């Protein structure tokens, strides 16, 4: 469904049938609520505990097809542009793509073959570095986030006497906002995520109805406006 | 009822089952203007019903309803209160507006006559545009006419502006006033003028004129103030 259909069925589901009908929502408000509902839905469906099914990214066909249009593959750029201080002397710093929402798969291609990057926790890092070896298992590499400015910088730890040729990252692209109409105005240009032009929902049509329902629920919680509704509907932001 | 019938049956009601024709014309013109206002406002009449609240009220204003286009006021380069306001002149014979629509490139949009309070409220928010099927309208500097600022959404152009309104009633005159009365006019017309309204409301216009005459001739202050309540 295109943006006009988002807005028309938003109006239908919000106030065109309600008995003591409420004021219609302005297009900026509808775009804001739709973008919020989109992000909430993405976060709810990525995490199993966030939805009533207990199903995350790839726990069912529907969850695969939900994020299928939001998956992207890119590469981390070696961060030798400027000097820096790494926590580990034997780690190579890489910069992830700017439009990164969530990392789901990483791999590094070295001279000793491809290796799956395992994101190790800080307590896990301490445990592993208290051991005599201090290097990954055969077909794996280690990873920790380092000092990041304006984009995520990442330290890749591989086994000794190994060089990294490329660093691929299969991630979830940051969703683009849903903007119903050109938000340009003479009184001031308002933006949802830095863009005023019309922006279609760049995800699969399977969850457009879900985004619409969530947006309507958020609109009605805003209309109710007491602390109660804000608190319970803020639980699903996550 | 022809004007002769108005004058003749005024005598039946006012002269105890049988005034100058100018005085009768003045009162009949005043009576219809009262009746139009009272039956327009729901609170002005005895039934609590306005323009479209019953079949009778619809036939009452049926012959006054007129549809006309507003003309762009590009001749005079005046100053508008809103940046994106296009000044439009309304028809000269305008009494009360009841529907306004504007035809843009994006589509027809129903004009909402927005109050001075609501404007300040809606213009204190981030976006400051109407809803996607509506336009705003506020009256602006007007000279011997009605001028309206059409504040439609930016990124849109106005191609048309239709106004459905109540036309100003013509005077009721029962004789050529210039024949006996030097240069007296009722609303700028000295000759015989018929009632331009539906025959359904002719009786109420005649009855109101008779009441206005009797109160005017009785001369009591209380009667004048009491029946002056219904003048709005």
From Swiss-Prot, chain A:
UniProt keyword Coiled coil present: no
The keyword Transmembrane is annotated on this UniProt entry: no
Protein localization: Virion
Record's keyword terms, sorted: Virion
Lineage: Viruses, Duplodnaviria, Heunggongvirae, Uroviricota, Caudoviricetes
Protein name: Ring protein 4/5
Extra remark: The barrel is composed of five stacked dodecameric ring structures. Rings 4 and 5 are both composed of gp34. Podoviridae-like phages usually possess only one such ring. The tail is thus rather long.
Task performed by this protein: Forms the tail multi-ring barrel with ring protein 1, ring protein 2 and ring protein 3.
A GO cellular component annotation in the UniProt record: virion component
Subunit structure: Homododecamer.
């Amino acid at each position: 469904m295109n943006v006009n259909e988002f807005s028309n069925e938003f109006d239908v589901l919000y106030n065109n049938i309600m008995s003591n009908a409420a004021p219609g929502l302005n297009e900026y408000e509808k775009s804001v609520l739709l973008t919020k509902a989109q992000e909430e839905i993405v976060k709810n469906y990525f995490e199993p505990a966030g939805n009533k099914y207990g199903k995350g990214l790839d726990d069912s066909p529907k969850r695969q097809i939900d994020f299928s249009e939001l998956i992207k593959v890119g590469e981390g750029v070696l961060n030798t542009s400027a000097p820096t201080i790494t926590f580990d002397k034997r780690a190579k710093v890489y910069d992830l793509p700017a439009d990164l929402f969530l990392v789901i798969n990483e791999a590094v291609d070295t001279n000793a073959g491809t290796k799956q990057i395992v994101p190790i926790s800080y307590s896990d890092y301490t445990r592993l570095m208290s051991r005599p070896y201090k290097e990954p298992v055969k077909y794996q590499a280690w990873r920790i986030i380092t000092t990041s400015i304006n984009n995520i910088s990442v330290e890749l730890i591989v086994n000794s006497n190994e060089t990294i040729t490329d660093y691929k990252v299969r991630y979830i692209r940051r969703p683009a906002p849903i903007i119903t109409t050109n938000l340009s105005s003479e009184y001031g240009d308002v933006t949802i995520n830095g863009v005023s032009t019309v922006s279609e929902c760049e995800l699969n049509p399977i969850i457009h109805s879900e985004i619409l329902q969530r947006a309507v629920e958020l609109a009605k919680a805003a209309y109710q406006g007491d602390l109660q509704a804000s608190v319970e509907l803020g639980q699903r932001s996550e």
